[PDB]
Symmetry: C3
């Protein structure tokens, strides 16, 4: 069957997505995950939730143990990983309150453990060169988009719909993230260059999470939450208004996530999961 | 009051900026600074000088302990940091002998300790996401620019002046640096790409020094020396003249800083750190 | 005295370039090389071969000890390094089966030890800032190109020959590589940006190998094998492996001919210039 793992970012440090059966602590060959995992069910579908930054949001993006988080979900039998990320916008049509079902990224991270395989003792033995041209699971991407439709949330498709038909708050059916290492935000010079490159949003947590999920043979899809990080540019009122907008976004994402879990459990994934595993084996360069 | 820390880059390994009142050898919770800190006064303004690469220039850019340098200056009560950096040019109006009071950068460094905060036991507790859209202290930038004006150095502002007003050598009133990790210089391929991105100069030492200074609640500003790393005898004499000019700028800048009140700016510097604590 | 080191990439894990005179297991101040170093002769030219990824290809690009590999070749008396790399294409005129004698690169690697010098106990004392504007040895580049001509392999020089004169398979007389850190391949987003930047090929192993070679005073040149990694877009794999196998055959011929061509010339002043560039780039002195 299927089992959906949920990596909750900012605004999901303490998830209460569903009535939890129990809390579980796990260990991995790559260290401890960010926190204990919340185990439960959405209908008849087993579901596990894991806060990326841990309760209290004490772990910065560059220090998150992405390998342990992904492998812990793997060892629990997860077949899919849905993830959230709070991001800043780089393009005019993506405004705070919108969401993005990402399909591309540009990686500007460094100093993070981004692979399970290598020649070091703390990694699995082998050399794995994974294809990443379309780095997400496309079937799971379209389930997030369909879940938004089922919850009456606007979906904007810039290939298909006019910019005048962009109704906020909307889910953008595609988008690219530039993942910076953090913890500082970008300079204006850096933001202008990323924008000139055509990137849609900026965040700090997508990579290596999406890469490691594919290495583990897991269907991974991310829903990004557009928020606002320039209240420095009436600060108490600005932060209060953005926090309220973000709270509304978290409500909608929780609705989308809960609907997406059910939509995953309603389909058969035998051939896709088999293809996920075979892609791992065929990417081994030592074999 | 105020206390101005000076981080001297290439050309400032053993600077004689003032009569030394006391040489002070310290360490920090993040390791040893690049060298002993030298204390003194410029007029009635307390000053502290620290060579970024240490005496003898034995520390390469990627191995400089930026965290320790910034923290040590903070520990001595510094309110400001003025820093120098020798850089190569990426644009035709930035010619060797010029200076740039930087206001922007693109970061291409890696493997450097770039923040005081984290979940590691070695780090300060908390998650700090500092805004960096305009990454320098603007009040201090304008003092460096005004210091150049007071020392009879041309100032060029491409926002307001035509290209025909760019008379060399000149302090460019704004500019962006690409900070590469080094120690090697860039390939022509990389230089072309950086140039097409609109970056003005290339150096190796600005990041994370500027980032950590804001984390520490300090007002940071950089004056870059445009030189030529690609001849040799004329370039070196030119660079010696640039160091003389920058020394004049730094001394005048310290006097200008001490002539103003910084209570509100300092309090704003500290409050920006607190408001950037995501864990709180 | 010239002595040519060879760093074999993918496809050269256990190469049979010449009769082995001595298999050498060496240690360097920066650790152990990827494997033992094999000494021999190509004609009268002393030669040393080393597989970049080791026997069995167990070392990924980001974990190769580039310092130890370059240092070990230098300590065995090598004056040159010829290196291969299997790469993907980013431009239409570079098709699988082509070779590229690289002359430029953009570095997107991180976390690798990229210099012999520093302030740490595991480093040579000093601060070295090497120029890299044209990062390869041009004399050795032209030898790789002439070797291709000598072995009856098409050579395309886009600054001299029109695009219609590009007959595949050909050796591209120039080219730029983007060296990503790996181990994963690029996204379409990243590949599109690298293509927009004018980069010709993508690989994972050029940097810091080329940088450390110049730091060691060695003449370094790379010949890149264009292959196909986008088969995901079963007959492709068998067709690409057969294509790659023929590419290895010709790169072997190019390397053996290049070694002979290196030995046919005097290198006294080029070697002295390589050493002088290292000393003139010391900023602590």
């Amino acid at each position: 069957k299927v089992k959906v793992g949920i990596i909750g970012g900012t605004g999901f440090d303490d998830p209460n997505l569903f009535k939890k059966v129990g809390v579980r602590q796990v260990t991995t060959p790559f260290g401890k995950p960010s926190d204990t995992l919340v185990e439960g069910f959405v209908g008849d579908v087993a579901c596990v939730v894991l806060p990326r930054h841990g309760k209290g949001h004490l772990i910065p993006p560059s220090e998150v143990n992405y390998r342990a988080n992904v492998w812990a979900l793997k060892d629990l039998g997860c077949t899919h990983i849905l993830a959230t990320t709070a991001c800043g916008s780089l393009q005019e049509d993506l405004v705070p309150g919108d969401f993005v079902v990402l399909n591309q990224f540009m990686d500007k991270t460094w100093g993070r453990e981004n692979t399970f395989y290598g020649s070091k003792p703390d990694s699995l033995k082998g050399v794995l060169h994974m294809p990443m041209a379309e780095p997400f699971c496309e079937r799971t991407r379209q389930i997030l988009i369909q879940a938004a439709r089922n919850k009456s949330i606007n979906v904007y498709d810039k290939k298909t719909m006019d910019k005048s038909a962009c109704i906020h708050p909307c889910v953008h059916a595609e988008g690219s993230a530039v993942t910076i290492n953090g913890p500082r935000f970008s300079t204006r010079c850096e933001s202008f260059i990323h924008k000139a490159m055509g990137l849609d949003i900026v965040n700090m947590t997508l990579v290596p999470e999406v890469s490691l999920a594919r290495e583990a043979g897991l269907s991974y899809a991310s829903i990004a939450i557009v928020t606002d990080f320039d209240c420095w540019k009436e600060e108490h009122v600005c932060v209060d208004m953005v926090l309220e907008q973000f709270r509304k976004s978290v409500v909608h994402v929780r609705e989308i996530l809960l609907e997406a879990v059910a939509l995953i459990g309603a389909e058969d994934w035998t051939k896709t999961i088999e293809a996920n595993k075979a892609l791992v084996m065929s990417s081994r360069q030592d074999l």
